[PDB]
């Protein structure tokens with residue numbers, strides 16, 4: 001655990017949290033990891049326990065052991081939680097993707113959203129209702145949901161989510177929204193304006209922010225551009241930067257700090273060895289679960 005909590009320092013600027021991710025393995029693999037989470041972060045996103053493949057492996061049959069643990073740990077330690085993720089084309093059981101009937105897919109889709117959201121109703125700050133539904137060029141991704149249900153699945157998803165748990169912030173998450181003018185950023189903005197104008201309850205836009213070294217400085221403008229979509233809020237949801245330089249991290253932290261709609265940042269992992277991009281050392285803590293230079297730099301910028 002670092003002595004100075006960046007989550008604390010960020011919140012002091014009026015932000016909601018600066019968090020990270022977790023699940024049974026990482027929260028138990030050693031003493032430092034959970035100690036770091038408790039000491040320096042204020043929000044948690046289940047790394048994999050809440051995805052479709054892990055919550056509904058077989059039609060209408062749920063398995064909540066893993067998610068229950070993540071949620072319970074967070075709730076027990078005063079950490080906000082971001083559910084992730086309800087609708088996505090990846091980490092999706094074959095039984096779902098094989099469905100060809102629209103009404104059948106809608107029934108299933110709603111049942112999944114409901115059963116999962118209901119189980120943690122009132123304990124979830126924000127849900128990534130939809131995840132990565134855009135092609136890089138701004139058009140809608142042709143996932144089973146899009147091919148079978150069509151564009152109406154967006155409305156069906158958010159509206160169901162909104163009714164099941166009106167206390168959660170409904171989000172649409174996506175990566176590569178890292179620079180103003182990027183096709184995906186424009187596609188996200190234009191679609192969201194359309195949807196919001198149609199009455200679809202979209203409370204925020206989630207920007208993963210999985211960056212390469214040197215892409216930090218361009219994040220501020222992307223955030224500004226996303227702000228034009230018109231959602232109540234926005235947030236950096238799955239942050240990690242190859243090289244984890246202090247410059248990239250401070251830039252990204254400032255990108256959020258100086259944008260009124262950015263409620264918080266969630267770093268996709270605690271220490272390097274546990275990173276899904278470990279080979280790039282893209283996290284704030286190293287192999288020894290010790291603060292890297294970037295962590296201290298972020299702290300001193302706040």
Ligand SMILES: O[C@@H]1[C@@H](O)[C@@H](O[C@@H]2CO[C@@H](O)[C@H](O)[C@H]2O)OC[C@H]1O
Nearest residue numbers: 047048084085131132175208238276
């Ligand atoms: O295998 C897991 C990965 O899928 C990853 O989780 C994913 C990373 O990519 C993002 O698009 C998704 O939003 C996120 O949930 O990180 C954990 C790995 O173990």
Ligand SMILES: O[C@@H]1[C@@H](O)[C@H](O)OC[C@H]1O
Nearest residue numbers: 068071072119120121123
């Ligand atoms: O432990 C579970 C809890 O996490 C969930 O919120 O409500 C149902 C319980 O069984």
